[PDB]
Amino acid sequence: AVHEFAKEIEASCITIERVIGAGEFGEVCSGRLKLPGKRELPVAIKTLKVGYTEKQRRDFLGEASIMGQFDHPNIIHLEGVVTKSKPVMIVTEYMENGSLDTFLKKNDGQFTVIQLVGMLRGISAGMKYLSDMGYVHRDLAARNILINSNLVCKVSDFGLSRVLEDDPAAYTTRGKIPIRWTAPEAIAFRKFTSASDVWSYGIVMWEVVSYGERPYWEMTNQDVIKAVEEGYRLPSPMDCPAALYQLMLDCWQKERNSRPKFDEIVNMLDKLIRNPAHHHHHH
Ligand SMILES: [Cl-]
């Protein structure tokens, strides 16, 4: 079933370089993938820990069959899976700089507006593509965005990704909701759409420009729900262009139909990158 969207990789082609983390289903590793005719490719390897439940196997490999459906430079690329032997692996591209929120915290105030808008343009490009493909991410946050050595940002973590149902275009939950990133109608009614992903994306915009501030700081989950419901919105980060902050507000429209489409976001961001007013340096 995962084989319809993922290539089976001969185990001998993977060598594990280092263990770099632990996910829900076991270790995450940096490794090398050797394909015929080329240099070893650096890869991220998710391993299914020994003694897993069979439900855990389905759900682990579940993400891989979601990933394998996408082919886009701002979505983490699947190299394939190992299923014919133990341990069971999912092999993705390697992102040198890890999570976006962490990366920006180490580099507080280090980027230009163009550099940061550039990151946000990449993220919205991948989301646009996801939207088009009939998926809702549901878990869009800076901490679920990965960034490479060229500062290219990619959507990652498709544990909560679901396929949109054919209606007047939503998924309804069955509840591991990240509240401060979530659109109000998704919180209240548990109705998830590309437009709730745009709300989350507004949050990501604010995190990126803030260099990895927690949205709403020490506010409790109840504090946030009530605040947003009342009309409160996060204030403008330091050194944020007015038009960027206004795009954030646009994403945070209470009525989802009023948020811009991802394609609209990408176009607005391209316009900023192409506007010399936003370039601190002209030589
Ligand atoms: Cl301005």
From Swiss-Prot:
<comment type="similarity">
    <text>Belongs to the protein kinase superfamily. Tyr protein kinase family. Ephrin receptor subfamily.</text>
</comment>
<feature type="binding site">
    <location>
        <begin position="20"/>
        <end position="28"/>
    </location>
    <ligand>
        <name>ATP</name>
    </ligand>
</feature>
<feature type="topological domain" description="Cytoplasmic">
    <location>
        <begin position="1"/>
        <end position="276"/>
    </location>
</feature>
<feature type="binding site">
    <location>
        <position position="46"/>
    </location>
    <ligand>
        <name>ATP</name>
    </ligand>
</feature>
<feature type="active site" description="Proton acceptor">
    <location>
        <position position="139"/>
    </location>
</feature>
<comment type="function">
    <text>Receptor tyrosine kinase which binds promiscuously GPI-anchored ephrin-A family ligands residing on adjacent cells, leading to contact-dependent bidirectional signaling into neighboring cells. The signaling pathway downstream of the receptor is referred to as forward signaling while the signaling pathway downstream of the ephrin ligand is referred to as reverse signaling. Among GPI-anchored ephrin-A ligands, EFNA5 most probably constitutes the cognate/functional ligand for EPHA5.</text>
</comment>
<protein>
    <recommendedName>
        <fullName>Ephrin type-A receptor 5</fullName>
    </recommendedName>
</protein>
<comment type="subunit">
    <text>Heterotetramer upon binding of the ligand. The heterotetramer is composed of an ephrin dimer and a receptor dimer. Oligomerization is probably required to induce biological responses. Interacts (via SAM domain) with SAMD5 (via SAM domain).</text>
</comment>
<feature type="domain" description="Protein kinase">
    <location>
        <begin position="14"/>
        <end position="273"/>
    </location>
</feature>
<feature type="modified residue" description="Phosphotyrosine; by autocatalysis">
    <location>
        <position position="171"/>
    </location>
</feature>
